[PDB]
Amino acid sequence: MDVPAVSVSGNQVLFGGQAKSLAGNSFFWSNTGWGQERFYTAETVRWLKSDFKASIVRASMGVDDEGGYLEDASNKTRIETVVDAAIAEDLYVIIDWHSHHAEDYRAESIAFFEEMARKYGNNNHVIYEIYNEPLQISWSNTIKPYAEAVIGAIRAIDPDNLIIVGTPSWSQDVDAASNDPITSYSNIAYTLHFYAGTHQQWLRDKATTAMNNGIALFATEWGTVDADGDGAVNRSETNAWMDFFKQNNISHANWVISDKAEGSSLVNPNAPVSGWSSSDLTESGNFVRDIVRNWGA
Ligand SMILES: [K+]
Ligand SMILES: [Mg+2]
Ligand SMILES: [Mg+2]
């Protein structure tokens, strides 16, 4: 095994037994026709590894909207392209069921994650993210029962690899999850998402409570801009979050590898799929490249 195994002990996600924070980058919605398919390539993964010094990539598979996995198996193929490349490159890779409604498609999630666990669960690289961003729904009554069903299905095949579970309110309410944690399975962490224009110390305080209640967090998506993925790059608030992640050994992936005309995109419209120069990178992209490159200092 050429990368260390990911596990959880108390409020820390460990890599080969070590508490630390790793950094990387999320792909956009995989959905056919949404414009960002062209970045789901081995070339792009290699460039993130070499030039961003990324440790993690996140493959964000659309599920239930037009063009998503429920309608079009090509979404899975794009995920596989990135997973295979991450394994070959000795990067961690998150397989993200990129839904806001996963409780409505429990059987389909189970079947997908069983397939992924069969294909990939003996690789230490692979991490499962079973529910991107629940909405304003109950942790105990809606998310938790979905999550226990999917986790049990994964764990029957793949006993060890990390599973990360979304939390209420766009993966903000990690404190609610921490009040009724998933104790019946090992190596479970919980999702925290922030955007620097929208979520400030109040959300850090909720995350701090969650960790001090005993659960481990993984910041599988965050942006430099506003929560809608557009707006001004907010350096000072981004940097306050980065300091909080480094202090608390929380790993993270930035939104997003995309050339869509919105502030969160790493690259300008029509940029090449890899090899990005500073003119190819957006204001966010240039700043994120510096954060991820220097993360290991
Ligand atoms: K657990
Ligand atoms: Mg395994
Ligand atoms: Mg604001």
Numbering used by the authors: 25 to 321
From the study:
We have characterized a glycoside hydrolase 5 (GH5) domain of a bi-catalytic GH5-GH6 multi-domain enzyme from the unusual gill endosymbiont Teredinibacter waterburyi of the wood-digesting shipworm Psiloteredo megotara. The enzyme is part of a large multi-domain cellulase comprised of a N-terminal GH5 domain, followed by three CBM10 domains separated by serine-rich linker region and a C-terminal GH6 domain. Furthermore, products generated from enzymatic hydrolytic of PASC by HPAEC-PAD analysis revealed cellobiose as predominant product with lesser amount of glucose, and cellotriose, as is commonly observed for cellulases. In summary, the observed activities, product distribution, and cleavage patterns strongly indicate that TwCel5 is a β-(1,4)-endo-glucanase with a mode of action resembling that of other known GH5 enzymes.
TwCel5CAT was crystallized in an apo form and a dataset diffracting to 1.0 Å resolution was collected. The crystal structure of the GH5 catalytic domain was solved to 1.0 Å resolution and revealed a substrate binding cleft extension containing a putative + 3 subsite, which is uncommon in this enzyme family. In contrast to most other GH5s subfamily 2, TwCel5CAT has a tryptophan (Trp226) in the outer region of the reducing end subsites. Of the 15 unique structures from GH5s subfamily 2, only three have a Trp in this position, namely the thermostable GsCelA from Geobacillus sp. 70PC53, the halotolerant Cel5R cloned from a soil metagenome and Cel5B from C. hutchinsonii, respectively. Of note, a comparison of the Alphafold2 model of TwCel5CAT with the X-ray crystallographic structure showed RMSD for Cα-carbons of only 0.35 Å. Furthermore, the side chains of the amino acids in the conserved active site and substrate binding cleft were modelled close to flawlessly.
